[PDB]
PDB file of all heavy atoms in Angstrom:
ATOM      1  N   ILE X  23     -23.785  11.225  -1.320  1.00 46.59           N
ATOM      2  CA  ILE X  23     -24.491  12.272  -0.599  1.00 46.59           C
ATOM      3  C   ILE X  23     -23.919  13.624  -1.002  1.00 46.59           C
ATOM      4  O   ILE X  23     -22.697  13.806  -1.032  1.00 46.59           O
ATOM      5  CB  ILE X  23     -24.382  12.042   0.917  1.00 46.59           C
ATOM      6  CG1 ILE X  23     -25.002  10.681   1.246  1.00 46.59           C
ATOM      7  CG2 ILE X  23     -25.033  13.178   1.686  1.00 46.59           C
ATOM      8  CD1 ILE X  23     -24.638  10.142   2.603  1.00 46.59           C
ATOM      9  N   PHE X  81     -23.162  16.558   8.119  1.00 60.68           N
ATOM     10  CA  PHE X  81     -22.243  15.600   8.699  1.00 60.68           C
ATOM     11  C   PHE X  81     -20.826  16.018   8.336  1.00 60.68           C
ATOM     12  O   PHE X  81     -20.497  16.028   7.141  1.00 60.68           O
ATOM     13  CB  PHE X  81     -22.588  14.219   8.142  1.00 60.68           C
ATOM     14  CG  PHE X  81     -21.671  13.129   8.570  1.00 60.68           C
ATOM     15  CD1 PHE X  81     -21.923  12.412   9.727  1.00 60.68           C
ATOM     16  CD2 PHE X  81     -20.566  12.797   7.807  1.00 60.68           C
ATOM     17  CE1 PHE X  81     -21.082  11.402  10.118  1.00 60.68           C
ATOM     18  CE2 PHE X  81     -19.724  11.785   8.194  1.00 60.68           C
ATOM     19  CZ  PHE X  81     -19.981  11.086   9.349  1.00 60.68           C
ATOM     20  N   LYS X  83     -16.527  16.070   8.034  1.00 59.79           N
ATOM     21  CA  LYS X  83     -15.319  15.255   8.098  1.00 59.79           C
ATOM     22  C   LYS X  83     -14.138  16.048   7.546  1.00 59.79           C
ATOM     23  O   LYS X  83     -14.279  17.180   7.081  1.00 59.79           O
ATOM     24  CB  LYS X  83     -15.497  13.920   7.373  1.00 59.79           C
ATOM     25  CG  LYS X  83     -15.990  13.992   5.962  1.00 59.79           C
ATOM     26  CD  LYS X  83     -16.307  12.601   5.433  1.00 59.79           C
ATOM     27  CE  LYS X  83     -15.045  11.769   5.341  1.00 59.79           C
ATOM     28  NZ  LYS X  83     -15.376  10.348   5.072  1.00 59.79           N
ATOM     29  N   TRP X  86      -9.995  12.521   5.098  1.00 57.41           N
ATOM     30  CA  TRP X  86     -10.252  11.088   5.171  1.00 57.41           C
ATOM     31  C   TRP X  86     -11.323  10.729   6.183  1.00 57.41           C
ATOM     32  O   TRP X  86     -12.261   9.990   5.860  1.00 57.41           O
ATOM     33  CB  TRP X  86      -8.960  10.344   5.516  1.00 57.41           C
ATOM     34  CG  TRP X  86      -7.910  10.456   4.471  1.00 57.41           C
ATOM     35  CD1 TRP X  86      -7.826   9.732   3.313  1.00 57.41           C
ATOM     36  CD2 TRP X  86      -6.787  11.334   4.477  1.00 57.41           C
ATOM     37  NE1 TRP X  86      -6.711  10.107   2.603  1.00 57.41           N
ATOM     38  CE2 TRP X  86      -6.064  11.094   3.295  1.00 57.41           C
ATOM     39  CE3 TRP X  86      -6.315  12.299   5.369  1.00 57.41           C
ATOM     40  CZ2 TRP X  86      -4.891  11.785   2.988  1.00 57.41           C
ATOM     41  CZ3 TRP X  86      -5.154  12.986   5.061  1.00 57.41           C
ATOM     42  CH2 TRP X  86      -4.462  12.731   3.883  1.00 57.41           C
ATOM     43  N   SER X  87     -11.215  11.241   7.402  1.00 60.25           N
ATOM     44  CA  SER X  87     -11.941  10.723   8.550  1.00 60.25           C
ATOM     45  C   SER X  87     -13.020  11.684   9.028  1.00 60.25           C
ATOM     46  O   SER X  87     -12.886  12.906   8.930  1.00 60.25           O
ATOM     47  CB  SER X  87     -10.963  10.437   9.694  1.00 60.25           C
ATOM     48  OG  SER X  87      -9.846   9.672   9.242  1.00 60.25           O
ATOM     49  N   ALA X  88     -14.095  11.112   9.559  1.00 59.71           N
ATOM     50  CA  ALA X  88     -15.159  11.737  10.323  1.00 59.71           C
ATOM     51  C   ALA X  88     -14.875  11.588  11.818  1.00 59.71           C
ATOM     52  O   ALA X  88     -14.214  10.636  12.239  1.00 59.71           O
ATOM     53  CB  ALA X  88     -16.508  11.099   9.983  1.00 59.71           C
ATOM     54  N   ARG X  90     -16.162  10.233  14.304  1.00 56.90           N
ATOM     55  CA  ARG X  90     -17.127   9.296  14.860  1.00 56.90           C
ATOM     56  C   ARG X  90     -16.798   8.945  16.308  1.00 56.90           C
ATOM     57  O   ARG X  90     -17.700   8.583  17.075  1.00 56.90           O
ATOM     58  CB  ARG X  90     -17.181   8.019  14.024  1.00 56.90           C
ATOM     59  CG  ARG X  90     -17.377   8.216  12.543  1.00 56.90           C
ATOM     60  CD  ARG X  90     -17.791   6.911  11.889  1.00 56.90           C
ATOM     61  NE  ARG X  90     -16.816   5.852  12.112  1.00 56.90           N
ATOM     62  CZ  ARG X  90     -16.949   4.863  12.993  1.00 56.90           C
ATOM     63  NH1 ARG X  90     -18.054   4.789  13.740  1.00 56.90           N
ATOM     64  NH2 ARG X  90     -16.008   3.941  13.152  1.00 56.90           N
ATOM     65  N   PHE X 118      -9.595  10.277  15.489  1.00 45.32           N
ATOM     66  CA  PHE X 118      -9.542  10.033  14.046  1.00 45.32           C
ATOM     67  C   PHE X 118      -9.127  11.293  13.309  1.00 45.32           C
ATOM     68  O   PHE X 118      -8.351  11.235  12.348  1.00 45.32           O
ATOM     69  CB  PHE X 118     -10.891   9.544  13.519  1.00 45.32           C
ATOM     70  CG  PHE X 118     -11.327   8.235  14.091  1.00 45.32           C
ATOM     71  CD1 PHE X 118     -12.670   7.945  14.251  1.00 45.32           C
ATOM     72  CD2 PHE X 118     -10.399   7.293  14.487  1.00 45.32           C
ATOM     73  CE1 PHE X 118     -13.078   6.734  14.780  1.00 45.32           C
ATOM     74  CE2 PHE X 118     -10.798   6.086  15.023  1.00 45.32           C
ATOM     75  CZ  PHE X 118     -12.140   5.810  15.168  1.00 45.32           C
ATOM     76  N   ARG X 146     -21.276  17.272   4.489  1.00 63.81           N
ATOM     77  CA  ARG X 146     -22.213  16.421   3.784  1.00 63.81           C
ATOM     78  C   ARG X 146     -23.620  16.660   4.319  1.00 63.81           C
ATOM     79  O   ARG X 146     -23.803  16.797   5.528  1.00 63.81           O
ATOM     80  CB  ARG X 146     -21.833  14.946   3.948  1.00 63.81           C
ATOM     81  CG  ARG X 146     -20.320  14.694   3.848  1.00 63.81           C
ATOM     82  CD  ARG X 146     -20.027  13.273   3.392  1.00 63.81           C
ATOM     83  NE  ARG X 146     -20.402  13.054   1.997  1.00 63.81           N
ATOM     84  CZ  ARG X 146     -20.442  11.864   1.416  1.00 63.81           C
ATOM     85  NH1 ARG X 146     -20.183  10.759   2.094  1.00 63.81           N
ATOM     86  NH2 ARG X 146     -20.726  11.777   0.121  1.00 63.81           N
ATOM     87  N   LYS X 147     -24.604  16.713   3.431  1.00 65.38           N
ATOM     88  CA  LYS X 147     -25.994  16.843   3.859  1.00 65.38           C
ATOM     89  C   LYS X 147     -26.343  15.734   4.840  1.00 65.38           C
ATOM     90  O   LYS X 147     -26.082  14.561   4.585  1.00 65.38           O
ATOM     91  CB  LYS X 147     -26.930  16.784   2.647  1.00 65.38           C
ATOM     92  CG  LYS X 147     -28.421  16.668   2.995  1.00 65.38           C
ATOM     93  CD  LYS X 147     -29.254  16.273   1.784  1.00 65.38           C
ATOM     94  CE  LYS X 147     -30.704  15.957   2.153  1.00 65.38           C
ATOM     95  NZ  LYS X 147     -30.852  14.700   2.967  1.00 65.38           N
ATOM     96  N   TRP X 148     -26.939  16.117   5.973  1.00 66.03           N
ATOM     97  CA  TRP X 148     -27.272  15.144   7.010  1.00 66.03           C
ATOM     98  C   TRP X 148     -28.416  14.241   6.572  1.00 66.03           C
ATOM     99  O   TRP X 148     -29.422  14.703   6.027  1.00 66.03           O
ATOM    100  CB  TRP X 148     -27.652  15.863   8.307  1.00 66.03           C
ATOM    101  CG  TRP X 148     -28.042  14.910   9.399  1.00 66.03           C
ATOM    102  CD1 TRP X 148     -29.312  14.553   9.761  1.00 66.03           C
ATOM    103  CD2 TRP X 148     -27.154  14.165  10.251  1.00 66.03           C
ATOM    104  NE1 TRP X 148     -29.268  13.644  10.786  1.00 66.03           N
ATOM    105  CE2 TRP X 148     -27.961  13.388  11.098  1.00 66.03           C
ATOM    106  CE3 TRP X 148     -25.767  14.083  10.365  1.00 66.03           C
ATOM    107  CZ2 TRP X 148     -27.420  12.538  12.063  1.00 66.03           C
ATOM    108  CZ3 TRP X 148     -25.230  13.243  11.314  1.00 66.03           C
ATOM    109  CH2 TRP X 148     -26.054  12.475  12.151  1.00 66.03           C
ATOM    110  N   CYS X 149     -28.272  12.940   6.833  1.00 63.52           N
ATOM    111  CA  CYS X 149     -29.305  11.952   6.542  1.00 63.52           C
ATOM    112  C   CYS X 149     -29.622  11.139   7.790  1.00 63.52           C
ATOM    113  O   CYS X 149     -28.712  10.765   8.542  1.00 63.52           O
ATOM    114  CB  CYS X 149     -28.877  10.997   5.425  1.00 63.52           C
ATOM    115  SG  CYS X 149     -28.366  11.781   3.913  1.00 63.52           S
ATOM    116  N   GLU X 150     -30.893  10.844   7.984  1.00 61.75           N
ATOM    117  CA  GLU X 150     -31.308   9.905   9.025  1.00 61.75           C
ATOM    118  C   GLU X 150     -31.172   8.497   8.459  1.00 61.75           C
ATOM    119  O   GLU X 150     -32.069   7.979   7.787  1.00 61.75           O
ATOM    120  CB  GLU X 150     -32.731  10.207   9.491  1.00 61.75           C
ATOM    121  CG  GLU X 150     -32.861  11.427  10.405  1.00 61.75           C
ATOM    122  CD  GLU X 150     -31.988  11.342  11.657  1.00 61.75           C
ATOM    123  OE1 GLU X 150     -31.781  10.221  12.188  1.00 61.75           O
ATOM    124  OE2 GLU X 150     -31.496  12.399  12.112  1.00 61.75           O
ATOM    125  N   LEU X 151     -30.030   7.878   8.719  1.00 57.59           N
ATOM    126  CA  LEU X 151     -29.756   6.542   8.195  1.00 57.59           C
ATOM    127  C   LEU X 151     -30.464   5.471   9.019  1.00 57.59           C
ATOM    128  O   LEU X 151     -30.477   5.519  10.258  1.00 57.59           O
ATOM    129  CB  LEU X 151     -28.252   6.281   8.191  1.00 57.59           C
ATOM    130  CG  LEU X 151     -27.416   6.574   6.942  1.00 57.59           C
ATOM    131  CD1 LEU X 151     -27.883   7.821   6.254  1.00 57.59           C
ATOM    132  CD2 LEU X 151     -25.976   6.705   7.325  1.00 57.59           C
ATOM    133  N   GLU X 156     -25.747  -0.367   6.266  1.00 54.94           N
ATOM    134  CA  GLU X 156     -24.438   0.003   5.743  1.00 54.94           C
ATOM    135  C   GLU X 156     -23.578  -1.237   5.580  1.00 54.94           C
ATOM    136  O   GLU X 156     -23.550  -2.111   6.451  1.00 54.94           O
ATOM    137  CB  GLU X 156     -23.753   0.992   6.668  1.00 54.94           C
ATOM    138  CG  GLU X 156     -24.441   2.314   6.703  1.00 54.94           C
ATOM    139  CD  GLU X 156     -23.546   3.378   7.260  1.00 54.94           C
ATOM    140  OE1 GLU X 156     -23.183   3.269   8.450  1.00 54.94           O
ATOM    141  OE2 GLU X 156     -23.164   4.291   6.491  1.00 54.94           O
ATOM    142  N   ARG X 158     -19.661  -2.712   3.853  1.00 57.50           N
ATOM    143  CA  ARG X 158     -18.338  -2.388   3.356  1.00 57.50           C
ATOM    144  C   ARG X 158     -17.960  -3.400   2.289  1.00 57.50           C
ATOM    145  O   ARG X 158     -18.212  -4.599   2.437  1.00 57.50           O
ATOM    146  CB  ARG X 158     -17.322  -2.389   4.493  1.00 57.50           C
ATOM    147  CG  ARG X 158     -15.906  -2.276   4.052  1.00 57.50           C
ATOM    148  CD  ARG X 158     -15.055  -1.716   5.159  1.00 57.50           C
ATOM    149  NE  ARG X 158     -15.380  -0.322   5.418  1.00 57.50           N
ATOM    150  CZ  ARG X 158     -14.855   0.390   6.409  1.00 57.50           C
ATOM    151  NH1 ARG X 158     -13.997  -0.141   7.258  1.00 57.50           N
ATOM    152  NH2 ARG X 158     -15.207   1.663   6.556  1.00 57.50           N
ATOM    153  N   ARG X 172     -21.344  -3.510   8.119  1.00 55.92           N
ATOM    154  CA  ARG X 172     -20.464  -2.495   8.692  1.00 55.92           C
ATOM    155  C   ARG X 172     -20.490  -2.521  10.209  1.00 55.92           C
ATOM    156  O   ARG X 172     -19.441  -2.526  10.861  1.00 55.92           O
ATOM    157  CB  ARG X 172     -20.845  -1.112   8.180  1.00 55.92           C
ATOM    158  CG  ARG X 172     -20.085   0.012   8.850  1.00 55.92           C
ATOM    159  CD  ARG X 172     -18.912   0.475   8.002  1.00 55.92           C
ATOM    160  NE  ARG X 172     -19.234   1.645   7.186  1.00 55.92           N
ATOM    161  CZ  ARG X 172     -18.859   2.879   7.469  1.00 55.92           C
ATOM    162  NH1 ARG X 172     -18.144   3.158   8.550  1.00 55.92           N
ATOM    163  NH2 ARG X 172     -19.198   3.870   6.645  1.00 55.92           N
ATOM    164  N   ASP X 212     -17.656   2.037   0.933  1.00 46.25           N
ATOM    165  CA  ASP X 212     -18.755   1.864   1.870  1.00 46.25           C
ATOM    166  C   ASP X 212     -20.050   2.274   1.188  1.00 46.25           C
ATOM    167  O   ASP X 212     -20.077   3.260   0.446  1.00 46.25           O
ATOM    168  CB  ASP X 212     -18.550   2.709   3.130  1.00 46.25           C
ATOM    169  CG  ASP X 212     -17.317   2.294   3.934  1.00 46.25           C
ATOM    170  OD1 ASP X 212     -17.048   1.080   4.059  1.00 46.25           O
ATOM    171  OD2 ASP X 212     -16.617   3.190   4.432  1.00 46.25           O
ATOM    172  N   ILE X 224     -20.945   5.826   0.063  1.00 57.16           N
ATOM    173  CA  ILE X 224     -20.606   6.667   1.209  1.00 57.16           C
ATOM    174  C   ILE X 224     -19.178   7.184   1.122  1.00 57.16           C
ATOM    175  O   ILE X 224     -18.946   8.390   1.210  1.00 57.16           O
ATOM    176  CB  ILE X 224     -20.847   5.921   2.548  1.00 57.16           C
ATOM    177  CG1 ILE X 224     -22.322   5.546   2.696  1.00 57.16           C
ATOM    178  CG2 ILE X 224     -20.427   6.786   3.721  1.00 57.16           C
ATOM    179  CD1 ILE X 224     -23.250   6.719   2.611  1.00 57.16           C
ATOM    180  N   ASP X 225     -18.201   6.296   0.943  1.00 55.61           N
ATOM    181  CA  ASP X 225     -16.804   6.719   1.012  1.00 55.61           C
ATOM    182  C   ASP X 225     -15.918   5.650   0.383  1.00 55.61           C
ATOM    183  O   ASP X 225     -16.330   4.503   0.218  1.00 55.61           O
ATOM    184  CB  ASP X 225     -16.382   6.987   2.467  1.00 55.61           C
ATOM    185  CG  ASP X 225     -15.042   7.727   2.583  1.00 55.61           C
ATOM    186  OD1 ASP X 225     -14.680   8.522   1.674  1.00 55.61           O
ATOM    187  OD2 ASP X 225     -14.336   7.505   3.598  1.00 55.61           O
ATOM    188  N   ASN X 227     -12.007   3.910   0.936  1.00 57.26           N
ATOM    189  CA  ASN X 227     -10.967   3.693   1.925  1.00 57.26           C
ATOM    190  C   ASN X 227      -9.850   2.851   1.320  1.00 57.26           C
ATOM    191  O   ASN X 227     -10.107   2.017   0.448  1.00 57.26           O
ATOM    192  CB  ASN X 227     -11.508   2.981   3.168  1.00 57.26           C
ATOM    193  CG  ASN X 227     -12.698   3.689   3.759  1.00 57.26           C
ATOM    194  OD1 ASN X 227     -12.551   4.675   4.488  1.00 57.26           O
ATOM    195  ND2 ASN X 227     -13.895   3.195   3.450  1.00 57.26           N
ATOM    196  N   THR X 233      -7.657   0.358   7.030  1.00 68.01           N
ATOM    197  CA  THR X 233      -9.102   0.226   6.961  1.00 68.01           C
ATOM    198  C   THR X 233      -9.541  -0.997   7.767  1.00 68.01           C
ATOM    199  O   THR X 233      -9.002  -2.091   7.585  1.00 68.01           O
ATOM    200  CB  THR X 233      -9.528   0.099   5.495  1.00 68.01           C
ATOM    201  OG1 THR X 233      -9.006   1.206   4.762  1.00 68.01           O
ATOM    202  CG2 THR X 233     -11.048   0.052   5.364  1.00 68.01           C
TER     203      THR X 233
HETATM  204  N1  ATP N   1     -24.633  12.105   5.233  1.00 71.44           N
HETATM  205  C1  ATP N   1     -24.646  11.388   6.359  1.00 71.44           C
HETATM  206  N2  ATP N   1     -25.616  11.625   7.266  1.00 71.44           N
HETATM  207  C2  ATP N   1     -25.632  10.911   8.399  1.00 71.44           C
HETATM  208  N3  ATP N   1     -24.791   9.950   8.792  1.00 71.44           N
HETATM  209  C3  ATP N   1     -23.839   9.736   7.877  1.00 71.44           C
HETATM  210  C4  ATP N   1     -23.693  10.384   6.660  1.00 71.44           C
HETATM  211  N4  ATP N   1     -22.592   9.907   5.963  1.00 71.44           N
HETATM  212  C5  ATP N   1     -22.107   8.982   6.758  1.00 71.44           C
HETATM  213  N5  ATP N   1     -22.811   8.822   7.936  1.00 71.44           N
HETATM  214  C6  ATP N   1     -22.524   7.911   9.047  1.00 71.44           C
HETATM  215  O1  ATP N   1     -21.177   8.092   9.447  1.00 71.44           O
HETATM  216  C7  ATP N   1     -20.428   6.870   9.307  1.00 71.44           C
HETATM  217  C8  ATP N   1     -19.054   7.177   8.758  1.00 71.44           C
HETATM  218  O2  ATP N   1     -19.158   7.511   7.354  1.00 71.44           O
HETATM  219  P1  ATP N   1     -17.883   7.550   6.427  1.00 71.44           P
HETATM  220  O3  ATP N   1     -17.692   6.244   5.741  1.00 71.44           O
HETATM  221  O4  ATP N   1     -18.010   8.782   5.499  1.00 71.44           O
HETATM  222  O5  ATP N   1     -16.676   7.861   7.471  1.00 71.44           O
HETATM  223  P2  ATP N   1     -15.139   7.448   7.657  1.00 71.44           P
HETATM  224  O6  ATP N   1     -14.552   8.040   8.890  1.00 71.44           O
HETATM  225  O7  ATP N   1     -14.393   7.768   6.342  1.00 71.44           O
HETATM  226  O8  ATP N   1     -15.201   5.842   7.799  1.00 71.44           O
HETATM  227  P3  ATP N   1     -14.412   4.646   8.539  1.00 71.44           P
HETATM  228  O9  ATP N   1     -13.888   5.092   9.867  1.00 71.44           O
HETATM  229  O10 ATP N   1     -15.449   3.508   8.647  1.00 71.44           O
HETATM  230  O11 ATP N   1     -13.288   4.246   7.561  1.00 71.44           O
HETATM  231  C9  ATP N   1     -21.296   5.964   8.429  1.00 71.44           C
HETATM  232  O12 ATP N   1     -21.072   4.587   8.723  1.00 71.44           O
HETATM  233  C10 ATP N   1     -22.719   6.425   8.770  1.00 71.44           C
HETATM  234  O13 ATP N   1     -23.244   5.813   9.946  1.00 71.44           O
END
Side-chain angles (χ1 to χ4, degrees):
Chain X
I23 300 164
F81 176 90
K83 52 188 295 169
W86 295 280
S87 311
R90 309 196 302 102
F118 297 150
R146 319 206 69 191
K147 170 194 172 291
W148 178 262
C149 306
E150 285 303 326
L151 266 38
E156 293 197 295
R158 171 156 291 175
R172 173 98 96 103
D212 297 320
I224 299 303
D225 193 30
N227 307 279
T233 306

